[PDB]
């Protein structure tokens, strides 16, 4: 199967320099093109630096011609792409590519890379178990609070990912430039008597993880 | 050397056909391939059409490409469209350089309603340690997507330390989340507040208390 | 919500708040302020929001305190960036649940219910009921209650409800309880 993941993103202040990776598997890496190409929420999916199959041939984006230059290593089936004087502008999610000739045929996960003069801001992990009342039910949801990071992403795993299904980590608001979010699972009331319910959450911009355990309150 | 035109929006009705189109501004659409990926909220591009009118393997055969010469719009048709179909859909082609069209965000209407899950969060008491008091409530579960938070406090309106994410599609439903910023002192001085959902004209809601039982 | 037609009976004063540095009471009734004829909850509300609207900074405030009618000078909270004077509506301590097999259930406890007096002291929040009730340990505990609505004529009988209930030690935390939650 054809895989791409990129690594390098996070936090930089403008006029600094970042370089991305892009590990590339499931394929013959040396006979195609491999390309960059980034997304805002305002601006859509912009191409900006494409590399050819021989790593003889480059191109780039007009906003980034100059700045930015795209590189491979046939024998780490890697490609990079080195950024310099990077501007509020290039704050976006950057995805590496595969080429197929005259199109686009795989895509990476994408890595969010931020250009701010703001600084990193680890979360704050609380846990959140229901208020005591009368009556239980039969199931019970619990939650994790990730509060006030800069900047995002963040993800929230439950028990190293064992708990999959009744996962819900929600969309994160921004007040006075940080990040809240929550992420709530659903179990039996059963499991939660008997096991340890445990909320991991990642920061990559600020290196962190914290693993939280819920207990009732 | 151009740029591809797309609508911004396009909504249909649940098992409809739809088409969603992408025009170039400069030079015969005919002249280069037009390539479609389909994304989906907080996940990358997969590719629906290649080379004008292919589909890869695992694309289901409800994604069609065309090209349109008098209207120099390449067009991608969905038919039977379902739930999963709601994403962006950009259009891509190229001759010196590389252009994405600025994608179409595809609605579904007429999915099974569905009235919004309220689960309500007291402050931890780790967070209280340090004088402070987020008061959470989730919404899940719902659609359509269209809701109205508000909170109370002893029932009466609260608009200050409020912070509302708006609806957003995560499995086959729509999740939001709102957070009422407090202190402890804050916190510890009310009876009640209260998380009131309003969704197509009907009130939903989950109240907290400091007050402790003995 | 009930409290907005109530008179201003202040409960619950924040901590270092403007109704505490200039030495509002738990107990205080206010009556004027500035302005504005404060009968209700709602009069000084709506007056609070005028006040800062018209850009008022200090103002003079008269509250009940004994029947003994105060005067003092009162910072005017700024209502759009977020200030508040700090006080906070009694709490009536009435039972909102009674837990299934717990001590007040034992006894027969109701929800409904109005505490009225705890171990002989008369008390008028929730939250003097959970102090006299953590107090007193493991001891048992006096409880005077006014149970449903009196016949007419009868509403000021002095006649209660009196339980008497010991307090049961939780087996996994060691924590005594009676089985009473509060009404929300």
């Known amino acids: 199967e054809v895989q791409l993941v990129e690594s390098g993103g996070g936090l930089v202040q403008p006029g600094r320099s970042l370089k991305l990776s892009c590990a590339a598997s499931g394929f013959t890496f040396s006979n195609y093109g491999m390309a960059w190409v980034r997304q805002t929420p305002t601006k859509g999916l912009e191409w900006i630096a494409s590399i050819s199959a021989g790593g003889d041939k480059t191109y780039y984006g007009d906003s980034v011609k100059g700045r930015f230059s795209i590189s491979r290593d046939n024998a780490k089936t890697t490609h990079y792409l080195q950024m310099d004087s990077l501007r509020s502008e290039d704050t976006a999610t950057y995805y590496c590519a595969k080429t197929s000739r005259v199109y686009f045929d795989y895509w990476g996960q994408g890595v969010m890379v931020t250009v701010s003069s703001a600084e990193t801001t680890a979360p704050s992990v609380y846990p959140l178990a229901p208020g005591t009342a009368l009556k239980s039910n039969s199931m019970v949801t619990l939650g994790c609070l990730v509060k006030g990071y800069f900047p995002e992403p963040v993800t929230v795993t439950w028990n190293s990912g064992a708990l999959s299904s009744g996962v819900h980590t929600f969309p994160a608001v921004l007040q006075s430039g940080l990040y809240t979010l929550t992420s709530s699972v659903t179990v039996p009331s059963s499991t939660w008597s008997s096991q340890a319910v445990t909320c991991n959450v990642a920061h990559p911009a600020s290196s962190t993880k914290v693993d939280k355990k819920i207990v009732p309150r | 050397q151009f740029v591809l035109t797309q609508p911004n929006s396009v909504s249909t009705n649940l098992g409809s056909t739809v088409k969603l189109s992408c025009k170039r501004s400069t030079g015969n659409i005919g002249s280069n391939y037009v390539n479609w990926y389909q994304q989906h909220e907080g996940r990358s591009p997969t590719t629906m059409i290649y080379?004008?009118?292919?589909?890869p393997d695992g694309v289901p055969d409800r994604f069609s490409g065309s090209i349109d010469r008098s209207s120099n719009s390449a067009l991608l048709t969905i038919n039977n469209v379902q739930t999963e179909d709601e994403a962006d859909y950009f259009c891509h082609s190229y001759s010196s350089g590389i252009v994405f069209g600025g994608g179409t965000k595809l609605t579904v209407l007429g999915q099974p309603k569905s009235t919004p899950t309220l689960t309500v969060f007291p402050p931890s008491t780790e967070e209280l340690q340090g004088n402070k008091a987020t008061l959470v409530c989730l919404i899940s579960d719902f659609y359509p997507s269209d809701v109205e938070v508000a909170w109370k406090a002893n029932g009466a309106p609260i608009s200050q330390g409020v912070d509302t994410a708006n609806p957003t599609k995560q499995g086959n439903k729509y999740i939001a989340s709102s957070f009422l910023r407090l202190t402890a002192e804050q916190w510890r001085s009310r009876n009640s507040f209260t998380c009131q959902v309003t969704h197509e004209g009907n009130t939903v809601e989950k109240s907290l208390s400091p007050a402790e039982c003995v | 919500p009930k409290y907005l037609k109530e008179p201003v009976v202040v409960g619950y004063v924040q901590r270092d708040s403007i109704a505490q540095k200039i030495g509002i009471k738990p107990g205080d009734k206010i009556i004027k302020i500035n302005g504005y004829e404060v009968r209700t909850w709602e009069d000084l509300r709506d007056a609070l929001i005028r006040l800062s609207l018209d850009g008022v900074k200090e103002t003079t405030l008269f509250l009940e305190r004994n029947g003994e009618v105060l005067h003092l000078t009162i910072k005017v909270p700024n209502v759009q960036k977020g200030e508040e004077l700090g006080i906070a509506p009694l709490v009536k301590p009435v039972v909102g649940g009674v837990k299934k097999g717990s001590p007040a259930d034992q006894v027969g406890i109701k929800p409904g219910d109005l505490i009225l007096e705890v171990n002989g002291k008369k008390i008028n929040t929730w939250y003097e009921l959970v102090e006299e009730v953590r107090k007193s340990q493991g001891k048992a505990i006096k409880l005077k209650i006014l149970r449903g609505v009196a016949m007419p004529g009868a509403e000021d009988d002095v006649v209660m409800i009196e339980k008497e209930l010991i307090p049961a030690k939780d087996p996994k935390t060691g924590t005594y309880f009676i089985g009473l939650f509060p009404k929300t």
């Open positions: 080379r004008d009118d292919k589909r």
